[PDB]
């Protein structure tokens, strides 16, 4: 009968629970291994799902290959499966949609369909603090971006340019990496100098002289502490009780405390001007429902703004230096533009004159094409998503992944994509531009279409608002580098490959260049010890 088989189910169960633990832990790995494999083969039979990349190790998925070489990973998947495909990543299912259609499917997705803050809050909230960026409803984000943008105006950039210039010259004068008054040539690691120059120039201009002054003290170590807490590791283990995580948390409290100290001091003195982003957020951080940002939230939002601009910009100036190091022809061409626009150095650099340096701006544009700082952008899917002109459905709980930086490197959209060529942007020197209709999500009119193959600043509701600041900063910095120095590689060295494991696609260090003064006898004035 069949009842006697049912007895043997029970018997077999009892014999299973009595196996030697050698065989039993052997089975606790062999069962999920086999089940994973069986599940994938079953999955490939669904026609309402994008092809899923095969993987051996459950939960881990394609994490290794994706983690180390994501563009190579995407190209292989693209050849095998086309532009839409899925892969497992440390517990999650990522659906990749490559190319301009993918830009459109993700950046222009319905607010109800996808969530950025659901993807990122665990990465950023620990670092920035509560109440801001991804620790708040999207509508709050939209207004925060409006608040920050309102400090990032043309009139602010006119005032930031000499402050940024002052910092670059102070760095050339005082830093051990240069000391131009004492040395006429030297070797630097751009992954040491550019992060420093970046935080010095961004602090001075966006936070002001007090906050810049504090980076000359041991307080600077908190920034370094806070900086470590910004790592992909936060995606799997956002909070685990080790030391790294406590120095981070301490840094957040300590730095936000310093900003709040200055904010409350400015208000108690009625010392509220138009100097910096701090003045600006103090005068302009009331939401449309009338709720005012707290001083804590203002401080946290300052941290997020500085942190965002820090890693994107520092990686970008590093790459610019690295590409130009093997292109003395491009340095020469940029130097001639500087001499023409600044009347042989006699004109002081201003924001308006920066806008008349198309080749310098094209050099930034081309670096951002070859080295998009963020190789992958994510959203969590909130509701089932039908993929147009397919029968594909992306179910809620999945994640979508868009990669404009991958398209940046495709010969079909950029001929000879792997060649650094600033002249591919001749008569097209703008950081970005909308080829047509606009829309406003709450922080200004931006392009409605997100189909450009070039999208260094993303698009849609989550689009960057830092692009003009980053061009101002990079522009001032590279204008001074060009006028002051020539540089090249040590023998046999060339452009390093990207390190894709970090949060930005920074160069693999150490990435060293050799500088020499164009004018060995030129002195940088000012007092120093």
CB under 5 to 8 A by kind: which of ligand 5L8, ligand HEM, none does 307 bind?
ligand 5L8
Buried b (16+ CB within 10 A) or exposed e, 47-58: eebbbbbebeeb
Rg of the Cα atoms in the chain: 26
Question: How many chain residues interact with ligand 5L8 (CB under 6 A)?
Answer: 12
Distance CA 50, CA 398 (A): 12
Indicate whether 50 belongs to the interface with ligand HEM (CB under 6 A).
no
CB under 5 to 8 A by kind: which of ligand 5L8, ligand HEM, none does 503 bind?
ligand 5L8
Name which of 58 and 442 has its Cβ closer to ligand HEM. 442
Distance CA 361, CA 358 (A): 5
- Site residues for ligand 5L8, 388-407, by CB under 6 A, read none
Nearest CA to 117 out of 98, 142, 94, 95 is that of: 142
Distance CA 305, CA 473 (A): 14
Contact assessment for residue 96 and residue 102, using Cβ atoms and an 8 Å cutoff: yes
Distance CA 136, CA 131 (A): 6
DSSP H helix total and E strand total for the chain: 20, 12
CB under 5 to 8 A by kind: which of ligand 5L8, ligand HEM, none does 400 bind?
none
Indicate whether 405 belongs to the interface with ligand HEM (CB under 6 A).
no
Distance between start and end Cα atoms, the chain: 97
Nearest-approach distance from CB 24 to ligand HEM, in angstroms: 45
User: Nearest-CB residue to ligand 5L8?
Assistant: 308
Site string for ligand 5L8, 79-118 (x = CB under 6 A): ----------------------------------------
> Dihedral angle at the C-alpha atoms of 219, 224, 225, 226, nearest 10 degrees?
100
Nearest-approach distance from CB 160 to ligand HEM, in angstroms: 11
Distance CA 148, CA 128 (A): 15
Indicate whether 464 belongs to the interface with ligand 5L8 (CB under 6 A).
yes
Q: Which stretch binds ligand 5L8 (CB under 6 A): 50-58, 101-109, 250-258, 307-315?
A: 307-315
Indicate whether 120 belongs to the interface with ligand 5L8 (CB under 6 A).
yes
> Annotated binding residues for heme b, as ranges?
120, 134, 145, 379, 462, 464
Distance CA 168, CA 172 (A): 6
DSSP state of 423: G
The residue from 93, 307, 341, 409 that contacts ligand 5L8 (CB under 6 A) is 307
Q: Concatenate the DSSP letters of all residues of 212-267 into one string.
A: HHHTTSTTHHHHHHHHHT-STHHHH-SS-SSHHHHHHHHHHHHHHHHHHHHHHHHH
Name which of 127 and 354 has its Cβ closer to ligand 5L8. 127
Nearest CA to 77 out of 52, 106, 47 is that of: 52
Residue 339 to residues 103, 342, 346, 418, 443, Cα–Cα distance (Å): 40, 5, 9, 30, 37
Q: Which stretch binds ligand 5L8 (CB under 6 A): 101-109, 301-309, 381-389, 505-513?
A: 301-309
Nearest-approach distance from CB 91 to ligand 5L8, in angstroms: 18
Indicate whether 145 belongs to the interface with ligand HEM (CB under 6 A).
yes
- Site residues for ligand HEM, 301-360, by CB under 6 A, read 305, 308-309, 312-313, 316
Indicate whether 469 belongs to the interface with ligand 5L8 (CB under 6 A).
no
Indicate whether 374 belongs to the interface with ligand HEM (CB under 6 A).
yes
CB under 5 to 8 A by kind: which of ligand HEM, ligand 5L8, none does 141 bind?
ligand HEM
Site string for ligand HEM, 79-118 (x = CB under 6 A): -------------------------------------x--
Which residues in this chain contact ligand 5L8 in the complex, by CB under 6 A?
A: 120, 124, 133, 304, 307-308, 312, 374, 377, 464, 466, 503
Which residues in this chain contact ligand HEM in the complex, by CB under 6 A?
A: 116, 141, 145, 305, 308-309, 312-313, 316, 368, 373-374, 377, 456-458, 462-466, 469-470
């Amino acid at each position: 009968i069949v009842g006697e088989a049912l007895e043997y189910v029970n018997i077999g169960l009892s014999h299973f629970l009595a196996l030697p633990l050698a065989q039993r832990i052997s089975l606790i790995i062999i069962i999920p291994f086999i089940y994973n494999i069986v599940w994938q083969l079953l999955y490939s039979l669904r026609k309402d799902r994008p092809p899923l990349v095969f993987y051996w190790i459950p939960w881990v998925g394609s994490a290794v290959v994706y983690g180390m070489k994501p563009y190579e990973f995407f190209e292989e998947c693209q050849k095998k499966y086309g532009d839409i495909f899925s892969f497992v990543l440390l517990g999650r299912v990522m659906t990749v949609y490559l190319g301009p259609k993918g830009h459109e499917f993700v950046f222009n997705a319905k607010l109800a369909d996808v969530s950025a803050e659901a993807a990122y809050a665990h990465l950023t909230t620990p670092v920035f603090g509560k109440g801001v960026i991804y620790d708040c409803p999207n509508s709050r984000l939209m207004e925060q971006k409006k608040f920050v943008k309102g400090a990032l105006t043309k009139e602010a950039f006119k005032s930031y340019v000499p402050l940024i210039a002052e910092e670059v010259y102070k760095y050339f004068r005082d830093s051990k990496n240069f000391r131009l008054n004492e040395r006429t040539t030297g070797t630097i690691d751009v992954m040491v100098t550019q992060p420093e120059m970046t935080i010095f120039t961004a602090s001075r201009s966006l936070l002001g002289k007090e906050m810049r002054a504090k980076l000359d003290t041991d307080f600077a170590y908190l920034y370094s502490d806070l900086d470590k807490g910004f790592t992909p590791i936060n995606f799997v283990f956002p909070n685990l009780p080790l030391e790294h995580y406590r120095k981070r948390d301490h840094a957040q409290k300590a730095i936000s405390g310093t900003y709040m100290s200055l904010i409350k001091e400015r208000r108690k003195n009625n010392d509220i001007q138009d100097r910096d982003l701090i003045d600006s957020l103090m005068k302009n951080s009331t939401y449309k429902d009338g709720v005012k940002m707290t001083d804590q939230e203002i401080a946290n939002l300052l941290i997020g703004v500085l942190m965002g601009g820090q890693h994107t910009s520092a990686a970008t100036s590093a790459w610019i230096l690295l590409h130009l190091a093997e292109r003395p022809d491009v340095q020469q061409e940029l130097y001639e533009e500087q001499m023409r626009v600044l009347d042989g150095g006699k004109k002081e650099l201003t924001y308006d004159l920066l806008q008349e340096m198309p080749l310098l701006n094209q050099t930034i544009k081309e670096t951002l094409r070859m080295h998009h700082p963020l190789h992958s952008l994510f959203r969590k899917v909130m509701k089932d998503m039908h993929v147009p002109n397919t029968s594909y459905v992306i179910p809620a709980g999945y994640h979508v992944l868009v990669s404009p930086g991958y398209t940046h490197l495709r010969d079909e959209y950029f001929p000879n994509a792997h060649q650094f060529n600033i002249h591919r942007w001749n008569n097209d020197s703008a950081s970005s531009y909308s080829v047509g209709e606009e829309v406003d999500y709450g922080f200004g009119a931006i392009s409605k279409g997100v189909s450009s193959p070039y999208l260094p600043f993303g698009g849609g509701r989550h689009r960057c608002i830092g692009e003009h600041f980053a061009y101002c900063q990079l522009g001032v910095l590279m204008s001074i580098f060009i006028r002051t120095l020539k540089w090249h590689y040590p023998e046999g060295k060339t452009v390093p490959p990207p390190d894709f494991t970090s949060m930005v696609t920074l160069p693999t260090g150490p990435a060293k260049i050799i500088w020499e003064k164009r004018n060995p006898e030129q002195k940088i004035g000012g007092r120093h010890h």
